[PDB]
C-alpha cells in the first residue's frame, strides 16, 4: 500500500561531514542514531567526529572528536542519562551531550572494536567486542574495564534485548546469556556477512548476503530479511523483500512490526505476524543509502547516503523524537 504524502515527507536534511569539515575527504557517515532524549540525532565521521542535531529540521547542536583521527570511523553510539558513549576501533570514550568529557578508556586489548551493547545490569554496564579475539566488560559508572573474556567468534553487532544478540563477521548470529555471556544458540542468517541487525524482546531481524566483496564478486544483499523467534527460540520464515534488504529496524510502538529499507531509499513497513499488509513509500536520496535508524517514538526515520547527505522523513504533523 502506498503512503499518503500527508504521512510521509522530507522534514529536514544535513550534510555531515560537509565539504568544509576536516573529515570530508575520508568519506560519508560511519553510523547514525537517534538519541533517546533531547530530540537529538547523532552522526559519526570516518575519522571519529560526532555531530548531533536537534529536531526534524536538523539544526546543528554539538560536535567533537571522540578518539584520535588515525583510529578511523566512529563505529557505534549508545545512550544513557549521563551522556553518550562512543566506540572507536582502538578505544572507548564517554562524554556529556555538551561535549564535556566524562571518562576515556584506551586498553591494550582494544585492537579493532566494532560493536557494543548493555548487559544484565541495566545501563550500568556495557559489553564491547569487534574483529579480535578479546572482549571487554566496562563499568559505565566507574569508567574502567572490570573483566576480560575470551571469544572465538568475531563480531560486527551487539544489542541487548531479552538476550545479547551478537552478529559475527561470517553471517551467523550468536544469542548470548546477558549475565555470563555464554552462547545459548547459533543461527545461520546469511552466507558471509550481516549488513544490519536489530532486535526486540520477541524477535531478531537481520540483513546480509552470501559473499563479501572481491574483485571477482560484489557483496550482494539477500532478497529477504532473516527472522528468528527469541520467544520460542527457533528460526522463522524470512520476510520477502525483492528490492534487496539493506537495513532493518523493529518498530518501537507496533511491537510485531518491522521497518525495511533498500539502498535506493525504497522503504517497506511490514508486520512480522502478517507480511500481507505492508506500506510502500519512496524517498529521493541523491546517492546510495548506507545507514538507517528510527527514533524511540517511531515517528522519526533517518537515512544517510554515500553522497554525505542525511535525511529525516516522517509525518508533517508535529513529530516528537522522545516523550
Amino acid at each position: 500500500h502506498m503512503m499518503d504524502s500527508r504521512d510521509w515527507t522530507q522534514l529536514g536534511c544535513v550534510a555531515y561531514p560537509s565539504p568544509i569539515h576536516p573529515d570530508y575527504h575520508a568519506g560519508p557517515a560511519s553510523t547514525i542514531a537517534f538519541d533517546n532524549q533531547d530530540e537529538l540525532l547523532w552522526i559519526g565521521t570516518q575519522k571519529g567526529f560526532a555531530g548531533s542535531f536537534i529536531g526534524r529540521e536538523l539544526k546543528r547542536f554539538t560536535a567533537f572528536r571522540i578518539h584520535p583521527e588515525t583510529d578511523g570511523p566512529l563505529r557505534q553510539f549508545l545512550f544513557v542519562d549521563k551522556g553518550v558513549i562512543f566506540l572507536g576501533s582502538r578505544s572507548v570514550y564517554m562524554a556529556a551531550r555538551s561535549g564535556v568529557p566524562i571518562w576515556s578508556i584506551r586498553h591494550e586489548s582494544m585492537q579493532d572494536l566494532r560493536a557494543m551493547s548493555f548487559t544484565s545490569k541495566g545501563t550500568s554496564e556495557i559489553l564491547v567486542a569487534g574483529w579480535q579475539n578479546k572482549m571487554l566488560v566496562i563499568d559505565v559508572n566507574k569508567g574502567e574495564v572490570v573483566k576480560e573474556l575470551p571469544t572465538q567468534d568475531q563480531y560486527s553487532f551487539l544489542k541487548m534485548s531479552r538476550y545479547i544478540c551478537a552478529a559475527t563477521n561470517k553471517g551467523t548470529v550468536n544469542i548470548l546469556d546477558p549475565i555470563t555471556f555464554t552462547i545459548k544458540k547459533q543461527w545461520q542468517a546469511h552466507g558471509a556477512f550481516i549488513n544490519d541487525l536489530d532486535t526486540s524482546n520477541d524477535f531478531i531481524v537481520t540483513c546480509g548476503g552470501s559473499h563479501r566483496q572481491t574483485h571477482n564478486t560484489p557483496a550482494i544483499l539477500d532478497p529477504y530479511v532473516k527472522v528468528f523467534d527469541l520467544k520460542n527460540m527457533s528460526a522463522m520464515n524470512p520476510v520477502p523483500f525483492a528490492p534487496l534488504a539493506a537495513h532493518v529496524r523493529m518498530h518501537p510502538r507496533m511491537l510485531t512490526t518491522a521497518i525495511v529499507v533498500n539502498q535506493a531509499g525504497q522503504i517497506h513497513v511490514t508486520d512480522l505476524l502478517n507480511p500481507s499488509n505492508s506500506q510502500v513509500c519512496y524517498t529521493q536520496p541523491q546517492g546510495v543509502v548506507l545507514h538507517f535508524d528510527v527514533s524511540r517514538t517511531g515517528e522519526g526515520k533517518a537515512l544517510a547516503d554515500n553522497k554525505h547527505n542525511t535525511y529525516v522523513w516522517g509525518s508533517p504533523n508535529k513529530i516528537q523524537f522522545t516523550e
Binding site: 569539515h21 547542536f61 562524554a95 576515556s104
Partner: protein
C-alpha cells in the same frame, strides 16, 4: 569604580610612603623618615604665637605613619602641663577631630621644640589652601557645602564641649580638608601653651569663644574673604542675604554675636535650629558610605578575577601529552579563552570590550549556571557548556600541573 576616584585613592597611597632623602631632618627617639609636609616655606603660626612645622614620620614600634606638629622654640616649664591635657584629648575620638596621641619635648632639631603627634590624613589640604589657593575666581561656595561645614564643626564642637574642654584653636588654616571632609587638626595645642600664660580664661568662657570663631570661619567662606575681621562683620552680614538663605544668616548672627547674659550657649541649641540640615548631611554620608561599599566589592572581586586569570594563562600555552579526557579539556579552555579575549566581528577587527572581559570572569568566579557557545577555528568543534563546568575543568588542570 570611576576614573577620578581611582586616581584619588592612588595618590593617597603614593603620599603615604613619599620620602625626602635630602631632607636634612633628624630621627628622634621613637620616630624616623621625617618628611616636610609644609607647602608654605615661610612660617608664621596663625594661633600658636611661635613658628610651626609639619612633618610626616613613621613610628619605630609599629611602622605606621603619623602627622607630627612641631612647635619651634618652646620651653617645657611644667611637665604637669603636657600630661594634664594629652590624657584628656586622647580620649576624644570624633570623625571631625584629628585624633591626638601623645606630646613630648625633643632637642634634635637643633633647638628646643614641643612635639604633638596626630593622625596622618594623606592628601589633606587645609581649608584655606583649598578654597583660596595661591598663584580670577568669583564663584561663590554653594550653600549646601556651607551647611556640611556647619554640621561637621558642630559635630566636633559637641564632642569637645562634653569633655569639658574647648577647641581653643579654631581657624580656616587649622582645619584640614579631604574630599569635602573637614577636621579640626590643631586641637590641644593651645591648652599646653596657655597652660600658664597670663590672663587665663575659664573653659566655660573659652567654649563661648569657640562659637564666635566658628561663626566667623563660615562667614569668611560665604563672602569669599579668607581673612575676615570683627571690624566689618555687620557689613559682611548684609552681603550674604541675597546670595544665601535668610536661615544661614541667622545662624552666623547667633554664632558670632554674644548671647544675652542669662542664656549662655551650647552646641545643643545650635543643632536645634539646623535639624533639617543635619538629616540631609546624614543622608549624604550614608549614601557615600554605600557608594564606597560597592567599590570595595568590585575591586575585591578584581583580586579574585586576577587569581583565575593566572591559572588560565598557565594551562593554555603548555602542551605535553596522556589519555583522551585530557585532550578534550585542554581544547575547551583554549576555546573559552577565545570567546572572551579574542572576540572579533565579521572581518576580524578586534572587539575590545572590558565589560565583556569582566562579565565572563565574574560568571566564572561564581560558577554561574549560564551556558555559552564555544566554537573552533574550523567550526568543527562545538561546545555548549556552563561556567560552573569550565571553572572546575580549569581548577583540575592547574591542580595536576603541581603534582
Amino acid at each position: 569604580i570611576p576614573k577620578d576616584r581611582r586616581e584619588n585613592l592612588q595618590k593617597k597611597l603614593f603620599h603615604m610612603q613619599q620620602l625626602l632623602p635630602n631632607s636634612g631632618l633628624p630621627n628622634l627617639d621613637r620616630w624616623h623618615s621625617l618628611f616636610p609636609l609644609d607647602t608654605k616655606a615661610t612660617r608664621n603660626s596663625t594661633c600658636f604665637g611661635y613658628p610651626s612645622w609639619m612633618y610626616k614620620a613613621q613610628n619605630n614600634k609599629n611602622g605606621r605613619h603619623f602627622a607630627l606638629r612641631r612647635i619651634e622654640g618652646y620651653r617645657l616649664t611644667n611637665e604637669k602641663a603636657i600630661l594634664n591635657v594629652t590624657k584628656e584629648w586622647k580620649k576624644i575620638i570624633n570623625a571631625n577631630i584629628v585624633t591626638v596621641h601623645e606630646a613630648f619635648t625633643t632637642e634634635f632639631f637643633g633647638d628646643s621644640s614641643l612635639i604633638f603627634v596626630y593622625d596622618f590624613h594623606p592628601l589633606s589640604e587645609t581649608l584655606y589652601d583649598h578654597h583660596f589657593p595661591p598663584n580670577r575666581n568669583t564663584n561663590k561656595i554653594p550653600e549646601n557645602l556651607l551647611w556640611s561645614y556647619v554640621c561637621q564643626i558642630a559635630n566636633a564642637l559637641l564632642a569637645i564641649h562634653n569633655a569639658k574642654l574647648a577647641a581653643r584653636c579654631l581657624e580656616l588654616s587649622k582645619i584640614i580638608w579631604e574630599n569635602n571632609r573637614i577636621r579640626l587638626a590643631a586641637c590641644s595645642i593651645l591648652d599646653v601653651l596657655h597652660h600658664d600664660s597670663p590672663n587665663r580664661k575659664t573653659i566655660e568662657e573659652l567654649q563661648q569663644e569657640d562659637f564666635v570663631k566658628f561663626g566667623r570661619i563660615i562667614l569668611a567662606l560665604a563672602t569669599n574673604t579668607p581673612t575676615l575681621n570683627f571690624n566689618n562683620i555687620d557689613a559682611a552680614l548684609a552681603t550674604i542675604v541675597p546670595r544665601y538663605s535668610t536661615q544661614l544668616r541667622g545662624v552666623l548672627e547667633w554664632l558670632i554675636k554674644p548671647s544675652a547674659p542669662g542664656e549662655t550657649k551650647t552646641v545643643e541649641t545650635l543643632l536645634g535650629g539646623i535639624t533639617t540640615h543635619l538629616a540631609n548631611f546624614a543622608n549624604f554620608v550614608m549614601q557615600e558610605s554605600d557608594e564606597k561599599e560597592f567599590h570595595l566589592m568590585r575591586e575585591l572581586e578584581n583580586g579574585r578575577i586576577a587569581r583565575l586569570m593566572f591559572k588560565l594563562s598557565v594551562v593554555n600555552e603548555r602542551g605535553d601529552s596522556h589519555n583522551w579526557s585530557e585532550t578534550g579539556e585542554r581544547l575547551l579552555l583554549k576555546l573559552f579563552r577565545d570567546y572572551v579575549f579574542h572576540q572579533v566581528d565579521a572581518d576580524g577587527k578586534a572587539r575590545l570590550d572590558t565589560n565583556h572581559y569582566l562579565n565572563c570572569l565574574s560568571k566564572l568566579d561564581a560558577s554561574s549556571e549560564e551556558q555559552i557557545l564555544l566554537t573552533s577555528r574550523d567550526n568543527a568543534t562545538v561546545f555548549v557548556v556552563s561556567y560552573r563546568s569550565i571553572r572546575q575543568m580549569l581548577d583540575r588542570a592547574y591542580g595536576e600541573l603541581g603534582k
